[PDB]
Amino acid sequence: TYLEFIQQNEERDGVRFSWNVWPSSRLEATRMVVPVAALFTPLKERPDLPPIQYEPVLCSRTTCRAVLNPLCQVDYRAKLWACNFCYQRNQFPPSYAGISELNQPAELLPQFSSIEYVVLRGPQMPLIFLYVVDTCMEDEDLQALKESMQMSLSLLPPTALVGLITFGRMVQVHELGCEGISKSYVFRGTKDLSAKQLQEMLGPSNRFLQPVQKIDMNLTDLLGELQRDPWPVPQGKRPLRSSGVALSIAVGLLECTFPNTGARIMMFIGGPATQGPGMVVGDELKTPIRSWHDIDKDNAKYVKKGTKHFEALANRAATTGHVIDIYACALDQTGLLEMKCCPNLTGGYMVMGDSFNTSLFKQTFQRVFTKDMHGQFKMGFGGTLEIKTSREIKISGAIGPCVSLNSKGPCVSENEIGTGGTCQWKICGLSPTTTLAIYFEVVRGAIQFVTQYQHSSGQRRIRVTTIARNWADAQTQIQNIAASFDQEAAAILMARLAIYRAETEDVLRWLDRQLIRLCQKFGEYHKDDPSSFRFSETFSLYPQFMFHLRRSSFLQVFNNSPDESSYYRHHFMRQDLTQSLIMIQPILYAYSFSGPPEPVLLDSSSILADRILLMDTFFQILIYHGETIAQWRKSGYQDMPEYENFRHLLQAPVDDAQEILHSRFPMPRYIDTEHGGSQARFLLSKVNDVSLQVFMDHLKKLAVSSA
Amino acid sequence: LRVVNLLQERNMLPSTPLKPPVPNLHEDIQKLNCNPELFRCTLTSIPQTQALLNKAKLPLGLLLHPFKDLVQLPVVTSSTIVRCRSCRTYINPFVSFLDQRRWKCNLCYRVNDVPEEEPHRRPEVQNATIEFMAPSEYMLRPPQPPVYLFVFDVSHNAVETGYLNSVCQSLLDNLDLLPGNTRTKIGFITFDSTIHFYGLQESLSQPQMLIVSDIEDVFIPMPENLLVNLNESKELVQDLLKTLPQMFTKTLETQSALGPALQAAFKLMSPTGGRMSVFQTQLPTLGVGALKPREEPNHRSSAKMTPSTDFYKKLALDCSGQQVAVDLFLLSGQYSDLASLGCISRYSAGSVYYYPSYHHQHNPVQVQKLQKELQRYLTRKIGFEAVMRIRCTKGLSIHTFHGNFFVRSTDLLSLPNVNPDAGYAVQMSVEESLTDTQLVSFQSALLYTSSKGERRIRVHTLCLPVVSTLNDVFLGADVQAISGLLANMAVDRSMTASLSDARDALVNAVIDSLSAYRSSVPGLMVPFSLRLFPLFVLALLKQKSFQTGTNARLDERIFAMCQVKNQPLVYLMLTTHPSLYRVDNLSDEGALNISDRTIPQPPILQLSVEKLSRDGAFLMDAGSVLMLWVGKNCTQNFLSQVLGVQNYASIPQPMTDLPELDTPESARIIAFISWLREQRPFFPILYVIADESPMKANFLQNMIEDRTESALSYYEFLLHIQQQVNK
Amino acid sequence: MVLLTMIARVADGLPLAASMQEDDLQQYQSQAKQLFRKLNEQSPTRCTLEAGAMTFHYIIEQGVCYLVLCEAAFPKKLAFAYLEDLHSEFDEQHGKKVPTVSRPYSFIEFDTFIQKTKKLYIDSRIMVANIEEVL
Lengths: 707, 727, 135
Ligand SMILES: [Zn+2]
Ligand SMILES: [Zn+2]
What we know:
The structure holds 3 chains of a larger assembly.
Chain A: H1 2-13, H2 26-31, E1 36-40, E2 73-75, E3 80-82, E4 89-91, E5 114-119, E6 128-134, H3 139-153, E7 161-167, E8 170-174, E9 184-188, H4 195-202, E10 210-211, H5 212-224, H6 243-257, E11 263-269, H7 292-296, H8 302-320, E12 323-329, H9 336-339, H10 341-345, E13 350-353, H11 359-367, E14 380-389, E15 393-399, E16 403-404, E17 419-420, E18 424-430, E19 436-442, E20 445-454, E21 460-469, H12 477-483, H13 487-503, H14 508-522, H15 542-550, H16 562-572, H17 577-584, E22 587-591, E23 598-599, E24 612-617, E25 620-625, H18 627-635, H19 644-663, E26 669-674, H20 681-686, H21 692-703
Parallel strand pairs in A: 6-7, 6-11, 11-12, 12-13, 25-26
Antiparallel strand pairs in A: 1-19, 2-3, 3-4, 5-21, 7-8, 7-10, 8-9, 14-18, 14-20, 15-17, 15-19, 16-18, 20-21, 22-23, 22-24, 24-25
Chain B: E1 3-5, H1 6-9, H2 27-30, E2 39-41, E3 46-47, H3 50-56, E4 61-64, E5 75-76, E6 96-97, E7 102-104, E8 111-113, E9 129-133, E10 147-153, H4 156-161, H5 163-173, E11 185-191, E12 195-199, E13 208-212, E14 228-229, H6 234-243, H7 258-269, E15 274-280, H8 311-321, E16 324-330, H9 338-341, H10 343-346, E17 352-354, H11 364-379, E18 383-392, E19 396-402, E20 406-408, E21 412-418, E22 424-430, E23 439-449, E24 455-467, H12 470-475, H13 479-496, H14 499-518, E25 525-527, H15 533-542, H16 554-564, H17 569-576, E26 579-582, E27 617-621, E28 625-630, H18 636-641, H19 664-677, E29 685-687, H20 714-725
Parallel strand pairs in B: 3-24, 5-9, 10-11, 10-15, 15-16, 16-17, 28-29
Antiparallel strand pairs in B: 1-25, 2-4, 4-22, 6-7, 7-8, 9-24, 11-12, 11-14, 12-13, 18-21, 18-23, 19-22, 20-21, 23-24, 26-27, 27-28
Chain C: E1 4-9, E2 14-20, H1 25-38, E3 46-51, E4 54-61, E5 64-71, H2 76-93, H3 111-118, E6 128-130, H4 131-134
Parallel strand pairs in C: 3-6
Antiparallel strand pairs in C: 1-2, 1-5, 3-4, 4-5
The complex binds zinc ion (2 copies).
PDB class: protein transport
Organism of A: Homo sapiens
Organism of B: Homo sapiens
């Protein structure tokens, strides 16, 4: 079963391709409508694979150096194996002298095509956590942020290193301990500093970065005594907040103390930067923070000069291998559009709420430190992804949280996509859900994903994933290829392409051109007869995914703030397929007396009066009460023991909501609305050219028309 | 009026202390004259013309101690301040009342009207020293609060000295005794290669240390709680003073960024102003104000002084503009370029305090000296944002000032602070012949803000007669005041020209003066008023300021010159010519008038080893210190009954003070020593260490009458003077 | 956003208490001391004056004038409430000793209450005329 095949390959190898059968010729390879790409999750979880404390087998070929995999032909009599990538034959290492046909290594069983090795050789480096705290916020917002950072302190390992950088108008780099004085270094938040200057101006562990088991006592007291930025805020003004400088000092500090080692720069902001490099807006309250309308009509002077400052810090720290998180909670915009490259280029998180004193932020912040069964953080550091392909496959590039290492070879394609021009990438921070999109070009077929990273325990590990897909039979080329098409993977992979060109500028024109082309090659129709157009089961969901994509907030940026659009695009470029389909096309369940909860369509026809809805947008859990049930609820039928069934109805969507309200890392905003309610707008905008019926009719007229 | 032949006396120093001359004035005018300690002139009889002044070859000038502590002070609070409508001279006892409702100004001769507010019985006319309550027009801003900022060197060398321990303990003991009301503000700054601020808040568990490492661009890290209210934050300040000497025990910082540290301290006090106390122990080597090292001269280098940079001079002028005064405590063991650092105190009305080779365990003498000097420095009265005008009768003109201040336009002396231990000097000339009047008057008006927030004006008025003959000028000569003015003139000659020129001008001052007296009358003949003139000048030429063939180091000389330019006339004389007594044979010829106390009065001996004796002990009063030299063959009675010791060999090497024994010989010498220090506010430390072999017998370096291998004796000096007088 | 506070006796313009912080002050302290001289018992008990980029505010209670200077954009509503907080405290502590004193700034130590009350207004978290006319 092709459906069974797609599901199993993602559960085992953490991959999902747009095409599972690849063009065996240069003819079809150039004419492929949707490119050959993969939705690869380097650290996907699975039913308890044994951590293989081996040393990965090294191919004797210098250029190749691919890892031993089940696709390699073995000879247990001659003690040799043939590398499936370069045909080079190798001699087994001494520790493999006793491998037999009845006792063979794990890296040759197809069940362990994806596998993780543990390399214990050098002394392990500790994890580093640098808190960067904004002090220009209300007392209730600062107090809750203090308690949350004190909570995360009690969850860190005893060997981890911690540091404190508070900032407002100035930047304070605290020296921990010091016994009875609590000292810190103050800097002007008006001029930037390089890592070399900061090193000379300041002077394994540091005076500023000490282990938790020795410093947690004083740090908890220091965080408990943190107070507002002492500088007054005159009437009609914003506070002088130096975000772009405190970040460059946080980057510069770790850059000269622990380069090339896992470290998290955790920045907490409660407003936009109003001073120094990286400025987002002025200090006068009469000038509103820039909007997309202000972006388009050139009414935003701080955007380009602000983004350039944060792209420089993003590339500085990603080169050093450090992670930047951005926890932004304020009532207005905070400047995420200008700082988006820091958590995007690195593997950093991006939490966005209204205030730090909310259940939304507090619970979301402790999800960051969610541990596994062995009590270890679900995060990896300093990942190095190298991709090795057959001599017939070239790599265009990757679209996701990564940075090019600019490594050249026979696998690099002249046509680059996203972060291309390389076969090696660095992901400073990865989680079990981090998903990359690699685009391949054709010039069995095999691809080997090698992921070297630092585990949250300090152990250096390597995750190897080798996959194989059949070349199309020459006498059944497009026929077999069409059946191996993954519409869900191709939809997100093509969406990953559109959001990239939009965020680095029409894009909707390219979307419709490719949708029509895909219809004209894999659809069934007579020419000039639109009613004769049908799609196979393999393709019958693709146009519906394109419909909700071109009308989504990812491409129709207006009706959102620039920060909200950058936040939506942030989480989309990182999630797996299951969550990505929810973002593009939210799922919707119905709750009524007539039947149990059932999934329903995303159209205005599903809105019934005597029914309760539960729409799951990845960012919003929304419960909608129809007009009849709202009146039945405003009346008071629930409290009466006569209608215990009406209590089941009103709380059935609540129960199902609580489950997915805890597993999802960016805890979605919970909405309880009804007919006539204000927040019912979120339901009516995701629902329903114009409508899908009209959109399909226009598509069929162009599919059966000229090619 | 008699004439003295210095070549036959050789014993002209009186056995009793020297008294200033009484100006040849009317009995009723002299009785109202200013106290000679607050205000005195070199020539009590003013020469009528400049030609007469140049013929006498004696310098004309004034020496004033304006803010000295007084036993009694009349404070007038009149609703109006009577000043002359022309030269703004305050009404003084030396004006002329004619119409009973009109008075003649003694300085500009203009007649004024007496306001409806016996007019000659008014207290403003019966006291030469008085203090007014200035009206609202005499202040540029509301009275500033008392502000104290302490800046401490905390480098590795400074931590080794151990000065921070005693300085912080003295602050805790004298925290309530600091001058000021409930508006008092206090602050702290430490520094090595980086500048350290110290915020103080009651909402925080402890003070917070804020580091400014941007040395080329200092700034203020916090808008509040750096200069905090002492009344509200009393407890928070006491905790920091107990914790400061423990934060830098293991410090490896070797360089000191003094220049940038003072800039941050200036920016901190710039809004309000006040007193800035700076403690430094080594050469400034890092940042702006960096000074190059220098090799010390020996006894074999000739007279071949000036600042190395204008930084600390430019910085003091900015401090003066913001009413900030800088006192420099230098506790260095090596060269520190005090010729450049001293500019921070000379041009800001501050004062420097030098403690050579201070060490908490190795130099207990400097430790107790810093203890007593800080006891005075923190408890003496103080004035803020002050100015002083010096007015003299028409015809006389001030042309050169001496002291620690900034001369504003129109001869206005700027005093960011004014302290009761500062002395000043003024040199003047007869611009217009005084043929009209027979009296001249000098008035100094000191406008300042007290520690209680009150604009006050302290006024001193002096009156002197005018004479027109050479002999009448020499008759009113004040030999102690002439030596004080010549020492200030020679200090400027050193900076301007060289040290040889400063020494030649001092000898020519005695030659030309006595050569002119001889040309208007065999041996060396001098008037009675100048019988000690060659003695005090030879003492000047042997003081550490101008000595030549000695092993003196650079910082010792500049500090000896900073004390010439800043100390009052009395302590300048005590330093230059210490009073030597014999204190092993005290008797009952003393001042036993004061109740039970007897207070022996031994005669003053001359500063010669010939006057000493190995059979007894000799006490020397050098003003700031008291040295008791014990002879080797001293009597067993003085050893056991005064020193509490059984032999000369068991006298402790550094003896910080005498024991109060149960012997009448102890009571006599304790009474005599107590009487010495009661004459001064600065507690003079006594040390009986001077032995005949303690290697600390600089007691002999004060024997100015005797010859050395690098100077003349007093009698050798008189022979050289006579050789040039009748050349 | 910035302050210059003065408390003076209306009869003779005698200063009683003030508070000034810079890090100019010389031109507006002069203009402040003319107002204290021009004011008498026929002056408006509540007034606001325009000085170009600056603006004075004062109230007169018990023959005592409470003047404050600030940049013109400072809320007029807050400047008067600031002077009322000063008057209610000053009249209680020294109100009965005001007509007898004769020294300038006989209540400097009121400096402490001014600055602590001042900080509660320059932190966001009646007649009008030109001052040049009255002078
Ligand atoms: Zn190979
Ligand atoms: Zn006059």
